[PDB]
Amino acid sequence: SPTKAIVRLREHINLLSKKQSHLRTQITNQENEARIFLTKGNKVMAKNALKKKKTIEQLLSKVEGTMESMEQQLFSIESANLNLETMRAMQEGAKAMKTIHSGLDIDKVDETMDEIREQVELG
């Protein structure tokens, strides 16, 4: 069911979201270590810290990408659902109007009967 899917996608995004914040935190921490090392020490350590930071960034980009794909799917479903609603309503409105086209124009008992009568008589 569509409702089931929407819930899964939303919950899934939530999880990815939790991960995104964690990843962001790691990125800042690593950058900070790089800053202090540049002071209380050797570059090499700083360079190493930055490289780590980059790989944490690339992983984040992927987390973000999965989220982006998921978000797109939600939009496509939410959009599709609306269209269905439009179609049903449009379908419903046609039925209502049909009952109207009937009205008393078709509810002409004499016209119908005579027609039936002639065919009987016609044999």
Author numbering: 18 to 140
Article, verbatim:
When we superimposed our Snf7 structure with available ESCRT-III structures, we were surprised to note that Snf7core does not fold into four α-helices, but instead, it contains only three α-helices that pack into a highly elongated structure. α2 extends into a ~90 Å long α-helix combining the α2 and α3 segments that were distinct α-helices in previously defined ESCRT-III structures. Although both structures exhibit an open conformation, we noted two different orientations of α4 with respect to the α1/2 hairpin. In open conformation A, α4 extends in the protofilament plane, whereas in open conformation B, α4 is positioned perpendicular to the protofilament plane. Superimposing the two conformations revealed that α4 can rotate by at least ~90° along the axis of the α2/3 helix. The L121P mutant exhibited a MVB sorting efficiency of 32%, compared to that of the α1/2 loop residue Asn59 mutant N59P of 75%, suggesting that the α3/4 loop functions as an important flexible 'hinge' that may facilitate different architectural stages of Snf7 polymers.
The endosomal sorting complexes required for transport (ESCRTs) are membrane remodeling machinery that mediate diverse fundamental cellular processes, including the biogenesis of multivesicular body (MVB) during receptor down-regulation, enveloped virus budding, cytokinesis, plasma membrane repair, nuclear pore complex assembly, and nuclear envelope reformation. ESCRT-III is a unique protein complex in that it is metastable and conformationally dynamic, forming hetero-oligomeric filaments of multiple subunits on membranes. Vps20 nucleates the homo-oligomerization of the most abundant ESCRT-III subunit, Snf7, which then recruits Vps24 and Vps2. We then crystallized and solved X-ray crystal structures of Snf7core in two conformations at 1.6 Å and 2.4 Å resolutions, respectively.
